[model samples]
Target: MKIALTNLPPEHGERIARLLVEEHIVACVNLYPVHSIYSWKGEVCSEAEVTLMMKVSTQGIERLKQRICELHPYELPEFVVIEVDNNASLREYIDFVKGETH
Candidate 1:
């Protein structure tokens, strides 16, 4: 399993979240409202954003990341994938997500 994180503008976040799940690239997504502080170019900026925490299978990772880039409004969108440890119950969790995708 893979946990992918990406931040989106409030206006566009929900749309991309729905599309990812509907397209079967992600098994599920958790959206959260956030205030992000970061530096862009030479300036510090803060914005009201929505973050998407997506549950995806290894098989779907590439497709999911590619789709996010195409749909995101940012010139350089944040896409981070964290490897999850597959212990006991996690095997079942992984199986369920695999079934959700191809």
Candidate 2:
């Protein structure tokens, strides 16, 4: 099991999340609103954004990332993948996601 993260405006969260799931790019997606504070193009920026946590198989991560870029609203969307240690994590969740996405 691995987790993919992408941040976008609140309004686009459901659309992207649902589209990715419908296309089998990811197995599941969870979203939450967060305040983003960062620097871009030499200026500090702060805004409200929704963070999407996408549950995906290790094999499907690359494709999921690719699809995210195509559908993301940001010019440089945040696509981060978090690795899960199988020895320490739940097995069934991992098993179900394995080979589940193309």
- Highest TM-score, which number? 1
How far is each candidate from the true structure, as Cα RMSD in Å?
Answer: 1.0, 1.2
User: lDDT tens string, model 2, 1-102?
Assistant: 689898999889988998988898888889999999999999999999999998998889888888888988889989998877977987887887775677
Whole-model lDDT values for every prediction: 0.92, 0.87
Model 2 Cα shift for residue 52 (angstroms): 0.5
lDDT tens digits by residue: candidate 1, 10-84: 999999999988989999999999999999999999999999999998888999889999999999999999878
Give me the displacement of residue 78 in model 1, in angstroms. Answer: 0.6
Q: Where in model 1 is the C-alpha error above 4 Å?
A: none
Clashes of each: 0, 0
Worst lDDT run of 10 residues, candidate 1, spans 83-92
Q: Estimate each model's TM-score.
A: 0.95, 0.93
Model 1 Cα RMSD, 1 decimal: 1.0
Worst 10-residue lDDT window for candidate 2 reads 93-102
Positional deviation of residue 24's Cα in model 1 after best superposition, in angstroms = 0.5
